Swiss-Prot record:
It is found in: Cell membrane. Coiled coil: none annotated. Residues 2-145 form the Histidine kinase domain. Autophosphorylated. The imidazole derivatives NH125, NH126 and NH127 inhibited the incorporation of phosphate from ATP at 50 ug/ml. The zerumbone derivative NH0891 inhibited WalK. Homodimer. Interacts with YycH and YycI. Member of the two-component regulatory system WalK/WalR involved in the regulation of the ftsAZ operon, the yocH and ykvT, cwlO, lytE, ydjM, yjeA, yoeB genes and the tagAB and tagDEF operons. Phosphorylates WalR. It comes from Bacillus subtilis (strain 168). This is Sensor histidine kinase WalK.
């Protein structure tokens, strides 16, 4: 089954934008884009990435969501950017590994789950980060329309 990913994400962000206190910025197209992934799996992917962005963010920092369309590859690129503590250069591609944490204390599965779910549905995921400036997590999903 297919879901309209723009609507879907807006509602996810809305439930985060409306609870407690933190800013949320959007680069989301007025386009009818569909992905074939169960609601609950894509929810876990996004919840896990958003949870990290907020957990590791300071001040009234911005979390920015983007969806960009690669028509040639038939892929959407979905990204979550924060202005948080960032990730050490040597660790940036360890962060998706099961139980891996940058520093007894914590689980370290959020991003492993996100990777497994994205990959199972034909996408890929990566982290771009500068220690002390912030992190972008980006994943792809096949789409139609
Ligand atoms: N947005 C981010 N900014 C800075 N560091 C991050 C960010 N996202 C993840 N990390 C680092 O990557 C590690 C792995 O993240 P992941 O979500 O898998 O585990 P966790 O948040 O530590 O635990 P869990 O999500 O299972 O409760 C984190 O422990 C943290 O060091
Ligand atoms: Mg986490
Ligand atoms: Mg693959």
């Amino acid at each position: 089954m297919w879901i309209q990913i723009v609507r879907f994400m807006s509602l996810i962000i809305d439930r985060f934008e409306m609870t407690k206190e933190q800013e949320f910025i959007r680069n989301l197209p007025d386009r009818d884009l569909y992905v074939e992934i169960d609601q609950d799996k894509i929810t876990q992917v996004l919840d896990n990435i958003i949870s990290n962005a907020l957990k590791y963010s300071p001040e009234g920092g911005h979390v920015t969501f983007s969806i960009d369309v690669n028509e040639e590859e038939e892929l959407l690129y979905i990204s979550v950017k924060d202005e948080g503590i960032g990730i050490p250069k040597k660790d940036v591609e360890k962060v998706f590994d099961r139980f891996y944490r940058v520093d007894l204390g914590g689980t370290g599965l959020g991003l492993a789950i996100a990777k497994e779910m994205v990959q199972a549905h034909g996408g890929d995921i990566w982290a771009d980060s500068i220690e002390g400036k912030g992190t972008t997590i980006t994943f792809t999903l096949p789409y139609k329309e």
